[PDB]
Design a protein around this ligand. Structure first.
Ligand code: NA
Ligand code: NA
Ligand code: NA
Ligand code: NA
Lengths: 175, 175, 175, 175
């Protein structure tokens, strides 16, 4: 049983546009921020909104920082054959580079997600504040092909280090 | 006889959207996954669909991996003057990096191809499962300018090493 | 109070498309050319128009040079939740790499800004000549969420070095 | 007199879509292939069409190679304020890397140019065969702001080395 037929028809048997919560856990060896997207030129973009002071001392009430979700590999051009777990790999370039389970408790930010598709031209949006990002969680599978949307928003806790990627790299140079 | 006149008209004399099979063989010194596309803003994208377990032990029922087909050079923006052989160069970044003629026998994957063009906005799709990807094959030419579509799907076997690109690089470090 | 609700609605309470002047000052440790943008697929592009002679001796009456404003990070794909300060980081790749407060006094150039968005397809444009680019200035904040558009065009002077980025790097190699 | 007013209107005073010939000469220290474009989301793309045999011995009747004309800098997103000289910088990545005035005499290729713009969605095309690419030529200026379209297609010869970029680099390693 293939997911897509030779002529292009999809063989997937199906409030469910974006998961209510986002999560941060390990996947393929990298601390990753993840959230789920349900349902031509379907592209996704993420911005991190936050108040901050530049080293120059300037206070930016609402600054927007980019959150890489496929822009450099084309992974942001989505094939919505079924629910997708969008991944933001936290690295030195990420605004979450020094975000730890601890700091999250006091952090204040808003991850805005923008999904655009098609002529049809539409825009779906969502937002994840710090309290809606769950450290140490992982999404339940939804594909069984059948999709169980009752598990769309569900996540569970898994063994995840509390330190940020920056702290992980620091502890490595020494050890 | 030019292929395109000064004013832009094409001088090509013409179920034929995508070749029924894909192939893997050498071209310009690189192991390459190839398939043919027949017929504004005409762009092509490829996703590799497959079930896999992350090193974290998580099982992803249907994960989508990117398959580079011109995204970084602009080669994915197609000029459909006639049938085109789309090329995915298998390198360290490719999900097929360690795919060999042997492993293919037991592998399970699905290459999904998405072609979008134009206002017109349309989407053509296709799919290639492991059994529809022929190792050691090459496509017959279709351009003679006249296009012989009876050879569109035809491929023939050519001397091709059975090892994966990863194995090729390993055998090189030592030898 | 979040900026964007879970369903995507924006919670911002609002001649105001582009700031009348642009500025050049330090932000996050980099000399930056900045201007403000007010109000799908909303993208911004900047071109530097100027007359110049190539080392070959050829005079180009009106040559267009690129001005990086997010093209390589996706920051040029705008989320117009409120007024945005567009940033062009002046580096070795920038046409303003050797622009100093001094040279500006004799320079002659025109920064053209092109904003495109959406179906809707529209184009807003503006222009900043050398006399409309203020060295040593910074924009006043407009977000308080409420936006005070009376401060949209307002800027004030701040302690800024008069030397160009190229001169900064030169003085560093030696010192 | 600015080229563009604060509100975006252009101050330019105007068979003229593409120059009949292309040229290859030095500009800003680089051997460059150039051609002129006259007249939203206005983007240009170039493909090099040619018959060739792969080292594997395979003959490709009509292979398409990419010709970089701004794809990596955004310079391919055009601002048609007046006639533009499109530039393809010949480097190690260019299909013209080893093209010399000599080889051109026997070469056989076709540079296809594709211009797309906007809703409006249109496509203008053109083609330049080897005999329509003039080595050692430069375009006359058209901007004086007034545009003299009688000089649109005009080019003149200038002192240009006959060797290819590859040969230039070879002669450098030794000398
Ligand atoms: Na479009
Ligand atoms: Na890119
Ligand atoms: Na890049
Ligand atoms: Na449209």
């Amino acid at each position: 049983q293939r997911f897509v037929d030779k002529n292009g028809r999809c063989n997937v048997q199906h409030t469910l546009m974006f998961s209510e919560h986002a999560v941060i856990s390990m996947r393929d060896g990298k601390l990753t921020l993840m959230f789920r997207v349900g349902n031509v030129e379907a592209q996704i973009r993420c911005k991190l909104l936050k108040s901050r002071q530049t080293p120059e001392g300037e206070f930016l009430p609402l600054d927007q920082l980019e959150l890489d979700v496929g822009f450099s590999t084309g992974a942001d051009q989505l094939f919505l054959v079924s629910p997708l777990t969008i991944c933001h790999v936290i690295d030195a370039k990420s605004p979450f580079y020094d975000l730890s389970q601890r700091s999250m408790q006091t952090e204040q930010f808003e991850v805005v997600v923008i999904l655009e598709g098609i002529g049809m031209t539409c825009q779906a949006r969502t937002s994840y504040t710090e309290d809606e990002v769950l450290w140490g969680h992982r999404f339940f599978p939804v594909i069984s092909f059948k999709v169980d949307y009752s598990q769309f928003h569900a996540t569970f806790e898994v063994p995840t280090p509390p330190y940020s990627v920056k702290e992980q790299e620091e502890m490595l140079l020494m050890s």
